[PDB]
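Q: I have two molecules that I believe assemble together. Could you output structure tokens for the complex as a whole instead of separate predictions?
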Amino acid sequence: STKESKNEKLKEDLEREQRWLDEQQQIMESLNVLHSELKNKVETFSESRIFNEL
Amino acid sequence: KLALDRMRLSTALKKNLEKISRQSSVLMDNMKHLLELNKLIMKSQQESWD
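A: Yes, here they are, computed for all two components at once.
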């Protein structure tokens, strides 16, 4: 009775850490594309652009 | 002391189950319930380990 309830706890734990691995990979795939857009936008707008646009 | 106790219990169960007695009609049912509960504990241990 205490090991089948340990099995019924772990099948509930089979859902949650698979959801937590799916969230952490969704953090990992979103931090990859924000690192690629920050590396491509190191150079900002120019100093002579701000004087002529304003 | 536990090894002497388990050797005396093993020889006592050997001389018990050597001759068919009147307590066998509930002892065989008790061993069948213990082997079915142990088969459930084997399948639960294998699925819990995997």
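A: One point stands out. The interface with chain B takes residues 3-4, 6-7, 10 of chain A (CB under 8 Å).
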